[PDB]
């Protein structure tokens, strides 16, 4: 089949039920609007796990599900197998991405 990799993305809860559109390098996009990010007990966050067993990288996108999206400004974010954290530009940032879930 493939190497079978997994990609975790944790986005801060800024809405309640925000959607996240992800696409494995060489795969297909998710059911737009992306997929509803699971609940992150972290402390009011969201979690999402997507497998890329066949892709060395996977793209992700943020969207409130309403009518506001957020992808690499206006394209789509890219992440490599593992765990990444997504936070809103609390100031003048344009969607911040980190490598590794938050530790509270």
Domains in the chain, CATH or no CATH each = 1-104 (2.60.40.10)
The C-alpha angle with vertex 84 and arms to 50 and 17, in degrees rounded to 5, equals 65
Residues whose CB is less than 8 angstroms from the CB of residue 23 and which lie 6 or more positions away in sequence, other chains included = 29, 30, 58, 59, 76
Q: Give the determination technique.
A: NMR
The C-alpha angle with vertex 9 and arms to 101 and 15, in degrees rounded to 5, equals 100
Distance CA 92, CA 60 (A): 21
Residues whose CB is less than 8 angstroms from the CB of residue 93 and which lie 6 or more positions away in sequence, other chains included = none
Q: What is the DSSP annotation of 23-51? A: EETTS---SSS-EE-EEETTTTEEEEEEE
Distance CA 51, CA 65 (A): 22
The CA–CA distances, whole Å, from 34 to 26, 29, 30 equal 17, 8, 5
Torsion region of 66: left, alpha or beta (phi above 0 gives left; psi -120 to 50 gives alpha):
alpha
């Amino acid at each position: 089949g493939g190497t079978g990799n997994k990609v975790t993305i944790y986005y801060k809860k800024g809405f309640n039920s925000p959607y996240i559109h992800y696409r494995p390098a060489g795969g297909s996009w998710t059911a737009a609007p992306g997929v509803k990010m699971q609940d992150a007990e972290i402390s009011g966050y969201a979690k999402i796990t997507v497998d890329i067993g066949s892709a060395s990288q996977l793209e992700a996108a943020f969207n409130d599900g309403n009518n506001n999206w957020d992808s690499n400004n206006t394209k789509n974010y890219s992440f490599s197998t593992g765990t990444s954290t997504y936070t809103p530009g609390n100031s003048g940032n344009a969607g911040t991405i980190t490598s590794g879930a938050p530790a509270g």
